[PDB]
Design a protein around this ligand. Structure first.
Ligand code: F60
Length: 116
């Protein structure tokens, strides 16, 4: 409360660390469904169904331009990519399984990097 401050973690490296995690995401062999925005006019239904599209390049743009207030808003956008993927694709479709794989990969790197 007022004039009573809880110790807060050192967040000085958060930008660099999220950037490094994102780079690893981007280089993963299963990243291809998520590298660029979905072709809004080539994937029928995607525009109406997916209310908040997100993808790695858009996350990179936002990260590079100071559009994430904190590391948690960055994680929200990454998870959004995979939540959207789950909504639209079958679990055992190539794109669906890629999403599950990428999510697992992200959450471990997230835990390992920040859950000190
Ligand atoms: O490459 C794709 C194609 C379709 C969807 C729907 C959510 N994420 C997607 C990624």
């Amino acid at each position: 409360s007022m004039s009573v401050k809880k110790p807060k973690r050192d967040d000085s490296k958060d930008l660099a660390l999220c950037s490094m995690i994102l780079t690893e995401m981007e280089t993963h062999e299963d990243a291809w469904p998520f590298l660029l925005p979905v072709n809004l006019k080539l994937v029928p239904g995607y525009k109406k169904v997916i209310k908040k599209p997100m993808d790695f390049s858009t996350i990179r743009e936002k990260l590079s331009s100071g559009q994430y207030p904190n590391l948690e808003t960055f994680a929200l956008d990454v998870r959004l990519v995979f939540d959207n993927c789950e909504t639209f694709n079958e679990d055992d479709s190539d794109i669906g399984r890629a999403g599950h794989n990428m999510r697992k990969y992200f959450e471990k790197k997230w835990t390992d990097t920040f859950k000190v």
